[PDB]
Design a protein around this motif. Structure first.
Motif, PDB file in Angstrom:
ATOM      1  N   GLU C  22       0.884  -1.178   0.000  1.00 49.44           N
ATOM      2  CA  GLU C  22       0.000   0.000   0.000  1.00 49.44           C
ATOM      3  C   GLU C  22       0.919   1.225   0.000  1.00 49.44           C
ATOM      4  O   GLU C  22       0.599   2.184  -0.692  1.00 49.44           O
ATOM      5  N   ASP C  26       1.946   3.607  -3.587  1.00 45.62           N
ATOM      6  CA  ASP C  26       1.736   5.059  -3.411  1.00 45.62           C
ATOM      7  C   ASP C  26       3.029   5.744  -3.870  1.00 45.62           C
ATOM      8  O   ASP C  26       2.926   6.749  -4.567  1.00 45.62           O
ATOM      9  N   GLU C  27       4.192   5.171  -3.581  1.00 46.30           N
ATOM     10  CA  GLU C  27       5.504   5.764  -3.956  1.00 46.30           C
ATOM     11  C   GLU C  27       5.751   5.715  -5.467  1.00 46.30           C
ATOM     12  O   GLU C  27       6.539   6.531  -5.937  1.00 46.30           O
ATOM     13  N   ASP C 224      -1.425   0.994  12.246  1.00 44.99           N
ATOM     14  CA  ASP C 224      -0.577   2.155  12.608  1.00 44.99           C
ATOM     15  C   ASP C 224       0.830   1.656  12.965  1.00 44.99           C
ATOM     16  O   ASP C 224       1.787   2.377  12.697  1.00 44.99           O
ATOM     17  N   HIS C 227       2.513   0.612   9.696  1.00 44.00           N
ATOM     18  CA  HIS C 227       2.732   1.858   8.946  1.00 44.00           C
ATOM     19  C   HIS C 227       4.170   2.308   9.246  1.00 44.00           C
ATOM     20  O   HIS C 227       4.775   2.888   8.355  1.00 44.00           O
ATOM     21  N   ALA C 231       7.679   1.953   6.492  1.00 46.61           N
ATOM     22  CA  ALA C 231       8.482   3.181   6.297  1.00 46.61           C
ATOM     23  C   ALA C 231       9.973   2.829   6.287  1.00 46.61           C
ATOM     24  O   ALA C 231      10.664   3.355   5.422  1.00 46.61           O
ATOM     25  N   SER C 234      10.884   0.691   3.157  1.00 48.10           N
ATOM     26  CA  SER C 234      10.922   1.643   2.032  1.00 48.10           C
ATOM     27  C   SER C 234      12.271   2.374   2.044  1.00 48.10           C
ATOM     28  O   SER C 234      12.843   2.567   0.959  1.00 48.10           O
ATOM     29  N   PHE C 270      12.919   5.596  12.215  1.00 48.14           N
ATOM     30  CA  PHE C 270      12.420   6.513  11.157  1.00 48.14           C
ATOM     31  C   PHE C 270      12.172   7.907  11.738  1.00 48.14           C
ATOM     32  O   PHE C 270      11.732   8.057  12.866  1.00 48.14           O
ATOM     33  N   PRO C 272      10.895  12.013  10.141  1.00 50.92           N
ATOM     34  CA  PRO C 272      10.341  12.578  11.357  1.00 50.92           C
ATOM     35  C   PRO C 272       8.939  12.050  11.679  1.00 50.92           C
ATOM     36  O   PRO C 272       8.221  11.697  10.783  1.00 50.92           O
ATOM     37  N   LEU C 273       8.631  11.966  12.955  1.00 51.70           N
ATOM     38  CA  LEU C 273       7.278  11.610  13.442  1.00 51.70           C
ATOM     39  C   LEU C 273       6.847  12.856  14.219  1.00 51.70           C
ATOM     40  O   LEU C 273       7.533  13.168  15.197  1.00 51.70           O
ATOM     41  N   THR C 274       5.785  13.551  13.814  1.00 46.66           N
ATOM     42  CA  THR C 274       5.533  14.889  14.422  1.00 46.66           C
ATOM     43  C   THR C 274       4.205  15.054  15.165  1.00 46.66           C
ATOM     44  O   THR C 274       4.013  16.195  15.637  1.00 46.66           O
ATOM     45  N   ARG C 276       0.827  15.544  14.354  1.00 45.04           N
ATOM     46  CA  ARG C 276      -0.255  16.429  13.800  1.00 45.04           C
ATOM     47  C   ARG C 276      -0.527  17.777  14.499  1.00 45.04           C
ATOM     48  O   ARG C 276      -1.344  18.519  13.950  1.00 45.04           O
ATOM     49  N   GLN C 279       3.397  19.861  14.284  1.00 41.36           N
ATOM     50  CA  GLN C 279       3.825  19.925  12.864  1.00 41.36           C
ATOM     51  C   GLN C 279       4.168  21.378  12.539  1.00 41.36           C
ATOM     52  O   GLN C 279       5.138  21.615  11.806  1.00 41.36           O
ATOM     53  N   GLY C 360       4.485  12.965   0.920  1.00 38.62           N
ATOM     54  CA  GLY C 360       4.049  14.177   1.643  1.00 38.62           C
ATOM     55  C   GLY C 360       5.137  15.013   2.304  1.00 38.62           C
ATOM     56  O   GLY C 360       4.774  16.067   2.815  1.00 38.62           O
ATOM     57  N   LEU C 361       6.412  14.662   2.290  1.00 33.34           N
ATOM     58  CA  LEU C 361       7.392  15.453   3.080  1.00 33.34           C
ATOM     59  C   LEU C 361       8.466  16.120   2.227  1.00 33.34           C
ATOM     60  O   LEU C 361       8.570  15.747   1.070  1.00 33.34           O
TER      61      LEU C 361
HETATM   62  C1  LIG Z   1       0.787  17.833   6.379  1.00 33.13           C
HETATM   63  C2  LIG Z   1       1.591  16.571   6.305  1.00 33.13           C
HETATM   64  O1  LIG Z   1       2.811  16.559   6.103  1.00 33.13           O
HETATM   65  O2  LIG Z   1       0.879  15.316   6.511  1.00 33.13           O
HETATM   66  C3  LIG Z   1       1.709  14.332   7.118  1.00 33.13           C
HETATM   67  C4  LIG Z   1       1.774  14.482   8.609  1.00 33.13           C
HETATM   68  O3  LIG Z   1       1.174  15.408   9.122  1.00 33.13           O
HETATM   69  C5  LIG Z   1       2.574  13.568   9.515  1.00 33.13           C
HETATM   70  C6  LIG Z   1       1.887  13.562  10.869  1.00 33.13           C
HETATM   71  C7  LIG Z   1       2.708  12.128   8.978  1.00 33.13           C
HETATM   72  C8  LIG Z   1       1.417  11.303   9.171  1.00 33.13           C
HETATM   73  O4  LIG Z   1       1.766  10.028   9.681  1.00 33.13           O
HETATM   74  C9  LIG Z   1       0.762   9.224  10.329  1.00 33.13           C
HETATM   75  O5  LIG Z   1      -0.346   9.676  10.493  1.00 33.13           O
HETATM   76  C10 LIG Z   1       1.183   7.884  10.842  1.00 33.13           C
HETATM   77  C11 LIG Z   1       0.513   7.261  11.878  1.00 33.13           C
HETATM   78  C12 LIG Z   1       0.965   6.035  12.342  1.00 33.13           C
HETATM   79  C13 LIG Z   1       2.096   5.452  11.811  1.00 33.13           C
HETATM   80  C14 LIG Z   1       2.788   6.079  10.798  1.00 33.13           C
HETATM   81  C15 LIG Z   1       2.329   7.300  10.325  1.00 33.13           C
HETATM   82  C16 LIG Z   1       0.614  11.027   7.893  1.00 33.13           C
HETATM   83  O6  LIG Z   1      -0.561  10.303   8.238  1.00 33.13           O
HETATM   84  C17 LIG Z   1       1.418  10.171   6.916  1.00 33.13           C
HETATM   85  C18 LIG Z   1       1.834  10.869   5.633  1.00 33.13           C
HETATM   86  O7  LIG Z   1       3.049  10.302   5.186  1.00 33.13           O
HETATM   87  C19 LIG Z   1       3.029   9.853   3.811  1.00 33.13           C
HETATM   88  O8  LIG Z   1       2.045  10.073   3.134  1.00 33.13           O
HETATM   89  C20 LIG Z   1       4.205   9.108   3.270  1.00 33.13           C
HETATM   90  O9  LIG Z   1       4.075   8.983   1.858  1.00 33.13           O
HETATM   91  C21 LIG Z   1       4.294   7.720   3.913  1.00 33.13           C
HETATM   92  N1  LIG Z   1       3.339   6.785   3.357  1.00 33.13           N
HETATM   93  C22 LIG Z   1       2.066   6.809   3.695  1.00 33.13           C
HETATM   94  O10 LIG Z   1       1.676   7.526   4.566  1.00 33.13           O
HETATM   95  C23 LIG Z   1       1.070   5.940   3.029  1.00 33.13           C
HETATM   96  C24 LIG Z   1       0.467   4.917   3.739  1.00 33.13           C
HETATM   97  C25 LIG Z   1      -0.454   4.097   3.122  1.00 33.13           C
HETATM   98  C26 LIG Z   1      -0.764   4.314   1.798  1.00 33.13           C
HETATM   99  C27 LIG Z   1      -0.167   5.345   1.100  1.00 33.13           C
HETATM  100  C28 LIG Z   1       0.752   6.163   1.717  1.00 33.13           C
HETATM  101  C29 LIG Z   1       5.654   7.146   3.803  1.00 33.13           C
HETATM  102  C30 LIG Z   1       6.557   7.313   4.831  1.00 33.13           C
HETATM  103  C31 LIG Z   1       7.821   6.768   4.733  1.00 33.13           C
HETATM  104  C32 LIG Z   1       8.196   6.067   3.606  1.00 33.13           C
HETATM  105  C33 LIG Z   1       7.298   5.895   2.581  1.00 33.13           C
HETATM  106  C34 LIG Z   1       6.034   6.433   2.687  1.00 33.13           C
HETATM  107  C35 LIG Z   1       2.061  12.332   5.823  1.00 33.13           C
HETATM  108  C36 LIG Z   1       3.138  13.059   5.079  1.00 33.13           C
HETATM  109  C37 LIG Z   1       1.284  12.979   6.669  1.00 33.13           C
HETATM  110  C38 LIG Z   1       0.080  12.266   7.204  1.00 33.13           C
HETATM  111  C39 LIG Z   1      -0.857  11.825   6.100  1.00 33.13           C
HETATM  112  C40 LIG Z   1      -0.701  13.135   8.166  1.00 33.13           C
HETATM  113  C41 LIG Z   1       3.989  11.411   9.494  1.00 33.13           C
HETATM  114  O11 LIG Z   1       4.184  10.141   8.883  1.00 33.13           O
HETATM  115  C42 LIG Z   1       5.300   9.849   8.016  1.00 33.13           C
HETATM  116  C43 LIG Z   1       5.866   8.470   7.986  1.00 33.13           C
HETATM  117  O12 LIG Z   1       5.742  10.736   7.336  1.00 33.13           O
HETATM  118  C44 LIG Z   1       4.070  11.305  11.006  1.00 33.13           C
HETATM  119  O13 LIG Z   1       5.181  12.198  10.965  1.00 33.13           O
HETATM  120  C45 LIG Z   1       5.252  12.220   9.543  1.00 33.13           C
HETATM  121  C46 LIG Z   1       5.052  13.583   8.918  1.00 33.13           C
HETATM  122  C47 LIG Z   1       3.920  14.299   9.597  1.00 33.13           C
HETATM  123  O14 LIG Z   1       4.373  14.428  10.937  1.00 33.13           O
END
Ligand SMILES: CC(=O)O[C@H]1C(=O)[C@@]2(C)[C@H]([C@H](OC(=O)c3ccccc3)[C@]3(O)C[C@H](OC(=O)[C@H](O)[C@@H](NC(=O)c4ccccc4)c4ccccc4)C(C)=C1C3(C)C)[C@]1(OC(C)=O)CO[C@@H]1C[C@@H]2O
Ligand SMILES: Nc1nc2c(ncn2[C@@H]2O[C@H](COP(=O)(O)OP(=O)(O)OP(=O)(O)O)[C@@H](O)[C@H]2O)c(=O)[nH]1
Ligand SMILES: Nc1ncnc2c1ncn2[C@@H]1O[C@H](COP(=O)(O)OP(=O)(O)NP(=O)(O)O)[C@@H](O)[C@H]1O
Ligand SMILES: Nc1nc2c(ncn2[C@@H]2O[C@H](COP(=O)(O)OP(=O)(O)O)[C@@H](O)[C@H]2O)c(=O)[nH]1
Ligand SMILES: [Mg+2]
Lengths: 346, 441, 429
Positions: C22, C26-27, C224, C227, C231, C234, C270, C272-274, C276, C279, C360-361
């Motif tokens: 998943e 997306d990547e 979660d 998830h 990461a 990847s 991994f 950054p984890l921020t 919400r 952020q 998203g980053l």
């Molecule tokens: C405004 C904004 O930047 O939205 C961010 C966001 O706010 C935060 C909270 C996101 C958010 O992360 C989560 O909510 C989350 C919860 C539980 C476990 C893991 C993640 C985000 O959901 C996750 C999401 O990350 C991605 O979309 C990446 O592409 C990620 N892949 C996926 O999320 C994904 C999952 C399933 C299907 C498709 C995509 C990824 C990360 C590492 C390597 C490859 C891909 C992002 C940027 C955000 C949200 C959406 C809020 C963060 O997540 C990551 C890994 O970047 C948590 O910290 C980062 C950056 C931000 O702080």
């Protein structure tokens, strides 16, 4: 507590090369062995626990087969009757004098015959009916980190090299599962068995020689000593066992120069990796001799793993390096000497 | 004619190669598609000089260079970028797998299966030459390709061509900064093989250029592009006497006679003094007396060694632009008056000079200023002996424990190849102590 | 063309993979039907690493799903991204393992490994080159622990010069989820210490803590937690399938991070984890990631490196960034915290940079570390093991399926012989 003894031997010039006029490269001032070539501005020195100068018969430090035994291998049979285990390694390269210092010739015998005869002919002066002695014998090889028995006959079908397994018994130590252990009464039985084994040992042709060894061959002798002491009844109340490992190793095989491809390269890498582990284990036993808490990497290669109980503790370990004195063989001799130095760096 | 073949090996070599070819095209007027509009402007004139590019009948200019990596990633950006219609599409990639920071996989295992194809194009490149000078090899120590592949190539080129200049432009390892745990091994093993076979080996360190880009240009977040763009100018200064005209020409076969006394002591340095921003381009005269002094201060060396802990043996000085010779003689007199800059007793002269009239060219999107004059300095010191010890001391520790050796043995090496390579560098430490000794008679 | 073959065994491995695809799709831009609907051109140039071509510009992954029961397999197919799996790769059977290593290694797994090797051979000979394999599984049951280890033993014999990664989920210290974790974990470490090249120890208490006091989630379910693992996966394989200024494949990290061949158990992370809300109170810079990647509240190992020392570390960065920042920060870590690093390795950091970050980053990072603190995971199991093995508590369920007590002591000693290999490098002198 364990003592490693490295000894290094230099062979004399061949008949094939005493006429071809090869240039002598290895010298000695009695104690240390020096390596020099006119082309180089640099000359390297190597001091060992023992040097066996066999180059010129008219030397005041000549080392015949009666000296390489009395100085190195004889103190290992003196220790086996105390009830402790022994290991004796033979390292070299093809043309160095390994099979001549180990087994020998028809009328010039190496270490195995002068050791077995001095074993059987040394218990027949203490073989009472109160104390007895039993001798068993095994002979296997490591080829690409896979154990193989050499005293088992093949058949009329495809691959007849059956790989066996090395297990860890909790009390005694590691052992091979399914290895033919044979009983011996004399030296002639060992000779017949070994002659049957070295025809199954793995050999391939490379630029160095027609027949280069491609396996680490291990020859074991298990000695049991049953004593009967009075405890007010029937007397069988004693048996201490001792293990004697004599191992002929393979060479390093620089795969850079010999443009190897396929199984040879594969084999080469395997032998290079086993020699790297063995060296490390030997250099970790020497640190304990001085004194230091240290950890031995025995379970990194199969050879150092099967011989865990014959390398550490109250155990004696000897190592005979062989080197050629010719200038054609100077990168091999240097590698041999550098490998022997790290063993004993006390 | 005056001709040179460039070979870019590994990621560093290839990226530095990219920088070098973006600079070579602008000085001459070559568009990235290989064409020249001057063909229409003025008839019968050489601007895309035959030293770095080969011509066609269609008015194209194809560069005399070969890029090789073992992985397709870095060279797949040249095929999909601005300079795709410039290079001959035989850019050697051995994709399969790279050396992964192992010297052995770049020498024998994966290093083979591609070297013959490399030398074939190197023959096709030289057969097109009406008398060539030498080879420019751009690689880095520390990587598995930059070390291994280069050491294998250098040894074959030593048989095929022989009495030709083999100059190396290498990225030497920093003492503190590093991007690998196996740079010491991959350096000491490259030296053992690229010392009987190299003719001159120019060294640069990334840490030395970061401090320049901070202090001199006011950049506190520099990348590899702002780093390769100085390395481009240093190679352009060396290669200007073949391309452009000048008073004192200095060909490539002169360096190895100027800067290499003994056949093992051929590890000079490099520095490029007028590293100035557009804001400090003004407030500055930028004369020879300032630049040449700036080439002798430790804060402007492209290698992190203090030359006041050693003695200069020789020093080439390659000026570009509006430069009168008297301003060089007076500057060298000043540099010889000083007691800090100290020379050997067996080299009173210690100065080779070259002048070329063509000034540098400013890349669009750069951090370098336009200059009427520019200078390089290719020096040989004993201070390098204080770096080779460091890389050796690191080697002394890991190899005591035999760490990261299984990975070498596993790809066709011995334990004795390390001891033989480490003993060859303990002799190169004694030679640099011999050359610094006061002579007597 | 480097190619990875992805096996996934058991419930844990299958769910983590179902979340990983998943993530990778997306990547690269693939949809649940298999069709590319992206925007950039770098998404397809190196897509071979994880996918294979099909007829109508459809992309089918190299998934080899394995399970001894069909319940977990049915969930993946009846799910969001389940129509991107070749049905001939759902290799499964009936007669599950019963949280028993024997049933998955000798009885009910040996009768199915020859059908998984078929798909391995068919998905590997259809690949120009091959950097290696990677498995996701669990050292707490029988399928992921038993039927996974055997597959590694049988792939090394076939493909010894290729990589075998393993994203393992190890047992947790405080609270268990199976009562036979010690046996089923020691008997897998016995087969993951001789046959693999990179093992990444994941623990679920660390991921709960990340979800709690780093992400501020009060309902963290397993999706979660995976998830987070998806990461890291990847991140290890970003410089194979995207470009960069400093590239690092699998073998490049394995050659930096593994000084001796047995100590290949790493602790991932991994950034950054921020959470919400923080952020908009944080800077997207290199030091803000470096401080988060070296903090013990972000690693997934449940082992504090401050009770140990780093032997090597790795840092795979993703984003347009400066190299001087990376070099300077990774030097400052060693300079300020020299006690948490080894002296006989001068530089313990390996760096890698990729130019194309996660959708998203602007910047991302991934962390691998070899620490002696990993012994705390094993030293505990051997304390549980010998407490249950002295009394032979749950053993007849293992001897009744064709095993001996000698196969337990063997596994008990090696682990201990591994701790001594780590404690050798713990104190300074
Ligand atoms: C405004 C904004 O930047 O939205 C961010 C966001 O706010 C935060 C909270 C996101 C958010 O992360 C989560 O909510 C989350 C919860 C539980 C476990 C893991 C993640 C985000 O959901 C996750 C999401 O990350 C991605 O979309 C990446 O592409 C990620 N892949 C996926 O999320 C994904 C999952 C399933 C299907 C498709 C995509 C990824 C990360 C590492 C390597 C490859 C891909 C992002 C940027 C955000 C949200 C959406 C809020 C963060 O997540 C990551 C890994 O970047 C948590 O910290 C980062 C950056 C931000 O702080
Ligand atoms: N100046 C500069 N240095 C670089 C660049 N790329 C890599 N390096 C340096 O070169 C060393 C690593 O070498 P690489 O060029 O990545 O190695 P390689 O030759 O490709 O070899 P393998 O990838 O190991 O097969 C490190 O010191 C890097 O910092 C670059 O573009 N510019
Ligand atoms: N001290 C010595 N005195 C006389 N001859 C010696 C001595 N040491 C060695 N030799 C000669 O060395 C020769 C050894 O050659 P060879 O039989 O081929 O050994 P090898 O098989 O090549 N070594 P290896 O394959 O590793 O067992 C014998 O024929 C001896 O004549
Ligand atoms: N992270 C994660 N762990 C899981 C998941 N499902 C099970 N586990 C873990 O896996 C262990 C049980 O192993 P299990 O999957 O049942 O083994 P199997 O039945 O042989 O496949 C427990 O320690 C669980 O914490 C999941 O979806 N995510
Ligand atoms: Mg590279």
């Amino acid at each position: 507590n364990s003592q490693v003894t490295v000894a290094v031997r230099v062979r004399p010039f061949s008949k094939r090369e005493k006429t071809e006029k090869a240039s002598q490269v290895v010298f000695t001032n009695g104690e240390e062995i020096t390596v020099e070539h006119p082309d180089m501005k640099q000359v390297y020195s190597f001091i060992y626990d023992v040097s066996f100068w066999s180059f010129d018969e008219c030397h005041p430090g000549y080392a015949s087969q009666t000296t390489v035994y009395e100085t190195l291998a004889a103190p290992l049979l003196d220790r086996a009757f105390e009830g402790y285990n022994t290991c004796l390694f033979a390292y070299g390269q093809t043309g160095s004098g390994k099979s001549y210092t180990m087994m020998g010739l028809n009328e010039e015998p190496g270490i195995i015959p002068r050791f077995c005869e001095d074993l059987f002919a040394q218990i027949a002066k203490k073989q009472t009916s109160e104390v007895s002695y039993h001798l068993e014998m095994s002979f296997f090889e490591v080829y690409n980190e896979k154990i193989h028995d050499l005293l088992v006959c093949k058949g009329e079908n495809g691959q007849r090299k059956q790989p066996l397994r090395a297990r860890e018994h909790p009390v005694s130590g590691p052992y091979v599962e399914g290895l033919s252990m044979n009983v011996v009464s004399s030296y002639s039985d060992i000779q017949s068995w070994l002659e049957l084994g070295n025809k199954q040992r793995a050999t391939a042709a490379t630029g160095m020689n027609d027949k280069s060894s491609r396996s680490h061959s291990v020859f074991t002798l298990v000695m049991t000593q049953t004593k009967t002491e009075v405890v007010e009844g029937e007397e069988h109340d004693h048996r201490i066992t001792s293990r004697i490992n004599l191992v002929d190793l393979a060479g390093s095989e620089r795969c850079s120069t010999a443009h190897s491809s396929g199984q040879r390269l594969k084999e080469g890498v395997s032998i290079n990796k086993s020699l790297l582990t063995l060296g490390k284990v030997i250099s970790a036993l020497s640190e304990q001799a001085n004194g230091k808490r240290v950890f031995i990497p025995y379970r990194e290669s199969t050879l150092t793993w099967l011989l865990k109980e014959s390398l550490g503790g109250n155990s004696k370990t000897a190592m005979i390096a062989t080197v050629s004195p010719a200038a054609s063989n100077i990168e091999e001799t240097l590698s041999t000497l550098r490998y022997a130095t790290q063993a004993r760096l006390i | 004619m005056r001709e040179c073949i460039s070979i870019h090996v590994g990621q560093a070599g290839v990226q530095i190669g990219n920088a070098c070819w973006e600079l070579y095209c602008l000085e001459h007027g070559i568009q990235p598609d290989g064409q020249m509009p001057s063909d229409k402007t003025i008839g019968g004139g050489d601007d895309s000089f035959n030293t770095f590019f080969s011509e066609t009948g269609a008015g194209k200019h194809v560069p005399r260079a070969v890029f090789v990596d073992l992985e397709p990633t870095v060279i797949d950006e040249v095929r999909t970028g601005t300079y795709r219609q410039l290079f001959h599409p035989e850019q050697l990639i051995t994709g399969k797998e790279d050396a992964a920071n192992n010297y052995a996989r770049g020498h024998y295992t994966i290093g083979k299966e591609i070297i013959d194809l490399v030398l074939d194009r190197i023959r096709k490149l030289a057969d097109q030459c009406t008398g060539l000078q030498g080879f420019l090899v751009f690689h880095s120590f520390g990587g598995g390709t930059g070390s291994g592949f280069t050491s294998l190539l250098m040894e074959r080129l030593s048989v095929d061509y022989g009495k030709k200049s083999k100059l190396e432009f290498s990225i030497y390892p920093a003492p503190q900064v590093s991007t690998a745990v196996v740079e010491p091994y991959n350096s000491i093993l490259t030296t053992h093989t690229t010392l009987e076979h190299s003719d001159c080996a120019f060294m640069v360190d990334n840490e030395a250029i970061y401090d320049i880009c901070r202090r001199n240009l006011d950049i506190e977040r520099p990348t590899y592009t702002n780093l390769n763009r100085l390395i481009s100018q240093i190679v352009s200064s060396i290669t200007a006497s073949l391309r452009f005209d000048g008073a004192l020409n200095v060909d490539l076969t002169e360096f190895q006679t100027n800067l290499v006394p003994y056949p093992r002591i051929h590890f000079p340095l490099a520095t490029y003094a007028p590293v100035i921003s557009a804001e400090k381009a003004y407030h500055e005269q930028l004369s020879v007396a300032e630049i040449t002094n700036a080439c002798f201060e430790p804060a402007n060396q492209m290698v992190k060694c203090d030359p006041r802990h050693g003695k200069y043996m020789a020093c080439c000085l390659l000026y570009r632009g509006d430069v009168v010779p008297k301003d060089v003689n007076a500057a060298i007199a000043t540099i010889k008056t000083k007691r800090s800059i100290q020379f050997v007793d067996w080299c009173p002269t210690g100065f080779k000079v070259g002048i070329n009239y063509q000034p540098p060219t400013v890349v669009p999107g750069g951090d370098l200023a336009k200059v009427q004059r520019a200078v390089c300095m290719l020096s040989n010191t004993t201070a390098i002996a204080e770096a080779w010890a460091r890389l050796d001391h690191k080697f002394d520790l890991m190899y005591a424990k035999r760490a990261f050796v299984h990975w070498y043995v596993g790809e066709g090496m011995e334990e004795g190849e390390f001891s033989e390579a480490r003993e060859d560098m303990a002799a190169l430490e004694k030679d640099y102590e011999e050359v610094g000794v006061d002579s007597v008679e | 063309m480097r190619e990875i073959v992805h096996i996934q065994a058991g419930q844990c491995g299958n769910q983590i993979g179902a979340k990983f695809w998943e993530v990778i799709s997306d990547e690269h831009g693939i949809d649940p039907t298999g069709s590319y609907h992206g925007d950039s051109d770098l998404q397809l140039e190196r897509i071979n690493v994880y996918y294979n071509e099909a007829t109508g510009n459809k992309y089918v992954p190299r998934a080899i799903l394995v399970d001894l029961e069909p319940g977990t397999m049915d969930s993946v197919r009846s799910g969001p991204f389940g129509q991107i799996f070749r049905p001939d790769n759902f290799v499964f059977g009936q007669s599950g393992a019963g949280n028993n290593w024997a049933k998955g290694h000798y009885t009910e797994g040996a009768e199915l490994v020859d059908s998984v090797l078929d798909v391995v051979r068919k998905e590997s000979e259809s690949c120009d080159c091959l950097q290696g394999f990677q498995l996701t599984h669990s050292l707490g049951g029988g399928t992921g622990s038993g039927m996974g280890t055997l597959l590694i033993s049988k792939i090394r014999e076939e493909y010894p010069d290729r990589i075998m990664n393993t994203f393992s989920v190890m047992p947790s210290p405080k609270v268990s989820d199976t009562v036979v974790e010690p046996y089923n974990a020691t008997l897998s470490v016995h087969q993951l210490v001789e046959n693999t090249d990179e093992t990444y120890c994941i623990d679920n208490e660390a991921l709960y803590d990340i979800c709690f006091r780093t992400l501020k989630l009060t309902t963290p379910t397993y999706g979660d937690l995976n998830h987070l693992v998806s990461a890291t996966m990847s991140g290890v394989t970003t410089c194979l399938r995207f470009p960069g200024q400093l590239n690092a494949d699998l073998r490049k990290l394995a050659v930096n991070m593994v000084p001796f061949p047995r100590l290949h158990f790493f602790m991932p992370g991994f950034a950054p984890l921020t959470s919400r809300g923080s952020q908009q109170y944080r800077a997207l810079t290199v030091p803000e990631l470096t401080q988060q990647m070296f903090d013990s509240k972000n690693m997934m190992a449940a082992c504090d490196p401050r009770h140990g020392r780093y032997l090597t570390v790795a840092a795979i960065f993703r984003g347009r960034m400066s190299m001087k920042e990376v070099d300077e920060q990774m030097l400052n870590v060693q300079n300020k915290n020299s006690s948490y690093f080894v002296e006989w390795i001068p530089n313990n950091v390996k760096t890698a940079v990729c130019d194309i970050p996660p959708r998203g980053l602007k910047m991302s990072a991934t962390f691998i570390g070899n620490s002696t603190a990993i012994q705390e995971l094993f030293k505990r199991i051997s304390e549980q093991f010998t407490a249950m093995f002295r009394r032979k508590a749950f053993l007849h369920w293992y001897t009744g399926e064709g095993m001996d007590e000698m196969e337990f002591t063997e596994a008990e000693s090696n682990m201990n012989d591994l701790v001594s290999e780590y404690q050798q490098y713990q104190d300074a002198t």
